A paper describes a structure:
One of them, ATP-dependent protease Lon, is a member of the AAA+ family (ATPase associated with various cellular activities) and is responsible for selective degradation of unfolded, oxidatively damaged, and short-lived regulatory proteins, which prevents their toxic aggregation. Functional hLon is structurally organized into homo-oligomers consisting of six identical subunits. Following its [name] localization, Lon’s NTD specifically recognizes and binds protein substrates, which are then unfolded and translocated into the enzyme’s proteolytic chamber formed of the ATPase and protease domains, where they are degraded into small peptides. In this study, we investigated the effects that phosphorylating two Lon tyrosine residues, Tyr186 (found in leukemia cells) and Tyr394 - the only two found in its NTD - might have on the structure and function of hLon and the effect of polyphosphate on hLon’s stability and activities.
Author numbering:
A (entry chain F): 650 to 948
B (entry chain D): 464 to 649
C (entry chain D): 774 to 948
D (entry chain F): 526 to 587
E (entry chain A): 588 to 649
Write the structure that this text describes.
């Protein structure tokens, strides 16, 4: 690793993907199929629909497969069918590619208590992984019981992830006592949380902050504000730490429809390095201490 | 061995669509997805002048008719048929041969396919692809990818006969009962 | 192909170790458990406990009782988690002792909160269910469209069901 | 699917030096890169030597 | 008459089970060939008999 310098080649956004498809992939596949430009018409609207509904991933090859399929079907309908020039319209698209798989859905639009989004830089691009939390055994072990709420992490825990989760649990307890000492739910209740995998171990701690807030929600049962994401690392004191691969997480959040992205203050500049056209419509946030997040997520 | 390999010989390919469709319909009932896919392939290949050999992998439960449909496709398209088994295979030499300096070297089995078929554009059928082990000393998956490589196939060469041989018009087929165990690069 | 594997559960040690004992109902999973399968089973166990809490807090059988479940093998690892939904209802059934409504096949992926997720190989499971003679098939709402791609003649005689939140399933299995 | 190898190929073309792709991932035996001792029946040189021979140039873009 | 078919180890450098599968193949046997005499030979009429003490250890493709 140390023997060379590394540049970050990363994926393309829906608009960039559409441009790539229309200007390079479509004519290339058309030539590789032999159909004339006038004979086969592929409106940019159809390409946008295909990208939005069918091919959803950081890569681009799947869109190549879809365009190859539709071009082959147009050639089939031209050689022996009835139309001398296939006009591919969205209404017709249903028959060519079939009904739309990978239909657009946010996993939890309501986001009930104890669950929250998180922009995880997975091995392939970035995803909006959902961290879940829930009570797994009654809080009333004993009306006088002082046993702590031992936590049971899941989702192929890594020892580094185990330590990060323990630190997040301790910090969440400290914050809960600091804010509302009367509340003791999280203090003495066994809670099970699930952190979906796919995040590379280096970025594993990047979701730790999310864990905290999720727990806090379960403590007060307050659902987090709709379509809000966040990421970073905590150091047992609320001092958020910077994370890498911000562009992939940002594009994943943009695709998922989440509007508010909360990032460590240090990463702010790295977020501004990104192209302007990818940052429209999002209410980005920059923070360094976790306290502010608690206010934003729970107004 | 070298002069026995066909060169420039391309078996005539059928272009009639109704005839091929009827031939396929009289060989295997239903299974209309594969039938329509091959019809679309035939049409697009006919439209784009020359006929190219693109790879596709049938997959499903066993005894469903995947080998029989491969034979039916070979018959209907008019090109030569050939079957090949790779399940649990470990000695890449069977596909690559030997350096020819041995006392009894042989070429890969694909060159045997080309020689027996007497044509440069047959239909090669691969069986039990997902069963490849790629274990010690083996790793035939690399050479197999080389075969499916869209461009390197046009200049594929074996260790025995090192002259590059074009494999762009060959219509590969693969069969596997599940898509999980098959290597992702393949 | 596809198969109709019978997931099952039963008590394997008395719930009354002590009338006051608060020890949790540790679960034992058999059937050549895989790590992903073990974690999915634990997720299903926790979700079943939470659901029983929400519905009938009076019952604590599943809360404190050691239960053994058998999930027959045969499913490939990739679709292995698909059976998890069944596991949940099984436990819930065992929690209340009410037999599930007869000839009711189901499958899905629970995510610790009831929001079912799509599963693959829907056509194979559908044909296997038709062969088994079951009449009601409960599938995730996401996979709904995929079930409609099936040829018409394979879908006759069954009352397909589509769902996304496990709550709905609990209202169909146990009327 | 980002085109990393595609941009590598484009850079090879623009720079005008010969192109060659190499997949080392999952490779187990180093003998592929190093060949054999040439005395064994069938011993062959390393894959980089074959790349140099095929490329016909001493300064390709591996 | 093949004997003790199920006892085949199909181990290192061997795997005679593949050769068996070739021989018992209903159609490939019609053009079977060996490494010594490579001329294809017809084996459609030969009536093979396989004896095994148990049906489990025998290969599934066989
Ligand atoms: N239309 C059809 N429907 C069902 N079975 C068929 C059909 N056509 C041929 N078959 C049967 O399929 C069998 C071939 O099984 P196959 O799927 O090739 O096995 P494998 O999975 O090893 O390729 C043949 O024995 C033949 O009788
Ligand atoms: N910006 C782009 N414009 C046009 N085509 C692209 C662009 N990026 C990638 N592609 C195409 O998409 C494909 C991506 O494959 P690639 O990412 O190179 O494979 P791998 O991920 O194994 O490196 C390439 O064939 C390339 O032609």
């Amino acid at each position: 690793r140390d023997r060379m310098e590394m540049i970050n080649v990363s994926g393309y956004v829906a608009q960039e993907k559409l441009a790539i498809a229309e200007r390079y992939l479509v004519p290339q596949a058309r030539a590789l199929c032999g159909l004339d430009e006038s004979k086969a018409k592929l409106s940019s609207d159809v390409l946008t629909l295909l990208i939005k509904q069918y091919c959803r991933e950081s890569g681009v090859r799947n869109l190549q497969k879809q365009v190859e399929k539709v071009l082959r079907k147009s050639a089939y309908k031209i050689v022996s069918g009835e139309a001398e020039s296939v006009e591919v319209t969205p209404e017709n698209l249903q028959d060519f590619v079939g009904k739309p798989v990978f239909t657009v859905e946010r996993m939890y639009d309501v986001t009930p208590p104890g669950v929250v989004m998180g922009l995880a830089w997975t091995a392939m691009g970035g995803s909006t992984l959902f961290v879940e939390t829930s009570l797994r055994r009654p809080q009333d072990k004993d009306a006088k019981g002082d046993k702590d709420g031992s936590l049971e992490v899941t989702g192929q825990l890594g020892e580094v992830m185990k330590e990060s989760a323990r630190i997040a649990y301790t910090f969440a307890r400290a914050f809960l006592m600091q804010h509302a000492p009367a509340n003791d739910y999280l203090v003495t209740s066994h809670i099970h949380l699930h952190v979906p995998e796919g995040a590379t171990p280096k970025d594993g701690p990047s979701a730790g902050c999310t864990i905290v807030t999720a727990l806090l929600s379960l403590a007060m049962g307050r659902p987090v504000r709709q379509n809000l994401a966040m990421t970073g690392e905590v150091s047992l004191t609320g001092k958020i730490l910077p994370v890498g691969g911000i562009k992939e997480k940002t594009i994943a959040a943009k695709r998922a429809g989440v509007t508010c992205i909360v990032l460590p203050a240090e990463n702010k500049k790295d977020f501004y390095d990104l192209a302007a056209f990818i940052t429209e419509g999002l209410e980005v946030h920059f923070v360094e201490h976790y306290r502010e997040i608690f206010d934003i997520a729970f107004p | 061995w070298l002069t026995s390999i066909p060169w420039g010989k391309y078996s005539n390919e059928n272009l009639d669509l109704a005839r091929a469709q009827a031939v396929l319909e009289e060989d295997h009932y239903g299974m209309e997805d594969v039938k329509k896919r091959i019809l679309e392939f035939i049409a697009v290949s006919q439209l784009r002048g020359s006929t190219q050999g693109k790879i596709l992998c049938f997959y499903g439960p066993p005894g469903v008719g995947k080998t029989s449909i491969a034979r039916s496709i070979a018959r209907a398209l008019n090109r030569e048929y050939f079957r090949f088994s790779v399940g649990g295979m470990t000695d890449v030499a069977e596909i690559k041969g030997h350096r020819r300096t041995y006392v009894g070297a042989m070429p890969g089995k694909i060159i045997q396919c080309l020689k027996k078929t007497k044509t440069e554009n047959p239909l090669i059928l691969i069986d039990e692809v997902d069963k490849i082990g790629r274990g010690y000393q083996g790793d035939p998956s690399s050479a197999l990818l080389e075969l499916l490589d869209p461009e390197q196939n046009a200049n594929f060469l074996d260790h025995y006969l090192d002259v590059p041989v074009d494999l762009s018009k060959v219509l590969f087929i693969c069969t596997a009962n599940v898509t999980d165990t098959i290597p992702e690069p393949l």
